[PDB]
Amino acid sequence: HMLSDEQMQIINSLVEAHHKTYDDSYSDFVRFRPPVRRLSMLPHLADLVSYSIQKVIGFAKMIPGFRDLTAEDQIALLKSSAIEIIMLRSNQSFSLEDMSWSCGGPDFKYCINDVTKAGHTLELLEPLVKFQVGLKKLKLHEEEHVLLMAICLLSPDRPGVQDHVRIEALQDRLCDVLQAYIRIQHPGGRLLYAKMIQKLADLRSLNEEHSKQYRSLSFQPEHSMQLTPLVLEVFGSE
Amino acid sequence: HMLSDEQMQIINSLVEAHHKTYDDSYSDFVRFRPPVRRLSMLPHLADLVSYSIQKVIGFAKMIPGFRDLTAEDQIALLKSSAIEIIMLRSNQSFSLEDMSWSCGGPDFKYCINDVTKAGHTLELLEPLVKFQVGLKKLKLHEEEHVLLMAICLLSPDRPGVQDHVRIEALQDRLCDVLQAYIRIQHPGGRLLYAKMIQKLADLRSLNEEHSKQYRSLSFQPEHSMQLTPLVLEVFGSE
Amino acid sequence: HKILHRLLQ
Amino acid sequence: HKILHRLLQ
Ligand SMILES: C=C1/C(=C\C=C(/CC)c2cccc(CCCCCC(O)(C(F)(F)F)C(F)(F)F)c2)C[C@@H](O)C[C@@H]1O
Ligand SMILES: C=C1/C(=C\C=C(/CC)c2cccc(CCCCCC(O)(C(F)(F)F)C(F)(F)F)c2)C[C@@H](O)C[C@@H]1O
Question: B37 a known binding residue?
Answer without folding.
Answer: no
